[PDB]
Symmetry: C3
Subunit: 281 residues, 3 copies
């Protein structure tokens, strides 16, 4: 199924008939960081499997729902269960839910993820406002836009220099200051590792030489589809470790350690993003 205008239009028609909500904000929450979705008001839960033309997610399993409702007086749509390219999904499968958001009226997309720290100033538990990226799959002929261009959504050759909205970064920082946790908040460049292996010790050292501040396996595909069709983006990484220190000390990361950091910061991130949604222009 191609992520074209006709196919996205059929999915949007179903969603509108079932939910009665017209959202102007979309959210994609990182692993272990989804508690906000369980606080959406007057909400409607829609399994992906019920939506015409949505990608099949049963091989990977686990939760996959679209959730619509209200937060802080604002109308939102959330992806509960995000799709990752290391699972084998195609370009078209990743893009179609973002283009459905566009047709539903979304103007701003808020994203969180878990990432490894490269910059020596970053420690476990820190947050990074993403200000740019290095797309290793894109340089290497695996960009999410490889294929025919879908002209109704955007141009053949997108400019990504303003993909990460500067005013949304400022608002996120302002709220952290108001609540006295600004000592946790940095800005930085995100490296997209296709995955699913964690960067090796020598890959981490290479990323440091190339000016990367953090590394993860998500986010850049959605950002590019959103920028192509004119949706503004804020993206925030939660740092689980510093891979450069780990390489110097011969220490390892694993998924268990990552999820324990997510649990330690989940409630603060939930409150932060509730206020961001409330304050959006």
């Amino acid at each position: 199924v191609v992520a074209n205008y006709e196919n996205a239009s059929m999915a949007a028609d179903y969603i509108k008939r079932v939910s009665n909500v017209l959202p102007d904000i979309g959210i994609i929450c990182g692993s272990g960081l989804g508690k906000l979705i369980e606080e959406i008001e007057e909400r409607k839960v829609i399994p992906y499997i019920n939506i015409p033309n949505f990608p099949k997610t049963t091989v990977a399993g686990h939760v996959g729902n679209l959730v619509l409702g209200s937060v802080g007086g604002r109308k939102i749509v959330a992806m509960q269960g995000r799709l990752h390219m290391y699972e084998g999904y195609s370009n078209q499968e990743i893009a179609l839910p973002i283009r459905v958001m566009k047709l539903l009226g979304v103007r701003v997309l808020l994203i969180t993820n878990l990432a490894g720290g490269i910059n020596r100033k970053l420690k476990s538990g820190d947050f990074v406002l993403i200000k740019g990226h290095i797309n290793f799959p894109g340089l290497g002929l695996n960009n999410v836009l490889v294929g025919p261009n879908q002209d109704e959504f955007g141009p053949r050759f997108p400019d990504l220099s303003n993909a990460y909205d500067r005013l949304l970064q400022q608002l996120a920082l302002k709220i952290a200051q108001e609540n006295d946790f600004q000592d946790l908040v940095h800005e930085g460049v995100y490296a997209f590792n296709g995955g699913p292996t964690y960067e090796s010790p020598d890959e981490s050292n290479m990323l440091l030489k190339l000016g990367c501040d953090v590394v993860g396996m998500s986010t850049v595909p959605e950002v590019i589809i959103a920028c192509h069709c004119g949706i503004k983006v804020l993206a925030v990484s939660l740092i689980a470790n510093n891979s450069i220190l780990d390489a110097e000390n011969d220490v390892s990361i694993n998924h268990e350690k990552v999820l324990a950091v997510a649990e330690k910061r989940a409630d603060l991130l939930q409150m932060w993003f509730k206020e961001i949604i409330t304050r959006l222009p």
Copy 2:
């Protein structure tokens, strides 16, 4: 359809029956840089769609013709409408037209493209003689030769150290000097960005660290197929902008700005390449 000996042979037989031209020079012109093809003498235009085993190009649309005839007394074949890997074409689709050129008798392939400047000495409107490349798709398992080797055309493991003929670079420079535009002409290393997004500001900074002088989304796949089967190559980039300066100043590129630079240099490039064809050994 595989780019094998039998399939390329059938396409070549059709072309020979229709055109009566046996070319020893091939040309592939970059976007907005195709006016020379409209000056080919006693010419024959052959739509791709008419040629057995040529790749289907109707999803992308726009022009797709093989043009045969004479320039400066020399017999040439031109691709009018080049295939780009960011459109989703396979390795086999890109390679088959180059291998048909080989079977028709082509010994020299001349290529132009539009590119972004990385080296700080490069400005909008400059020309770069390509002397080497950095193939990000090839390091990353998307080389144009991934697949069975077609032994009739070349070896399993090609050496690319002489892919860009030094004597053709010297002849191109000599002609620029004769016409007093040598102040526009540089040499440099071409980075292959799979595309279709322009390099991000932080990707540009990374390319500078790695010794890249220019960046584009074409040319390296054709160069590798030509080198594999023993065709000599000259490749020239027209620089639309300097991406490093743009990153420092928070300024953007787009396709409209690129095509306006092409229009400004098209007539000089046309005259330059007509003389190169005339003077080839």
Copy 3:
């Protein structure tokens, strides 16, 4: 055919019925470096084409056998004819033979390859104990684990920091010292070039900047599948040339020159690895 538990189990059942050998050591030998396999004792040769669910290898051709028997009193299984991703094999085809080794009881995998030298201390004929890697395909969305995870074999997100066992590296060095060829033996980081073109002169210079010591087109996919399912690895490169010196001097490599270096070191490598097998804990 997916590299899942059921499919690997059927291949292992066939092998056990035919060979009567239960191996705890596996070996994969590099090109021109396979003579040890012809010295396996009380051996059984099994063509790939006879084994249920083994990948089809007839397009590439040449030898493809599983060989079981005894070396130095130890029970081993060898791949005679290794699969390379530049031939077009999928992730699933590369992984299935390694997962069959796991089900047969393999606990240690020994690997050799031919590689180009990047580090200025490396010369033709030197050996490199691999201590880490830089996986360009993996950063670029062509990791061998992209796809559904096969949970019976390993975790969704593997940690590769101990992929190259330190004690096996020490044992290999100890034996070289005992036989007074330790002046040939280095350690270093392996860059995975997807291939099949040799790294270009400007790619070599880039690899030097990024901290790579050697470059090759194999080994990293098998290492990652082995690490995922808990098999210990020793991997050794035989250096055919120094690509940085060749770039400075405008000299070329080719497959003929590579195989001549393999012939010159084959007998020493055979004796070295026989002793390693004999001495394994």
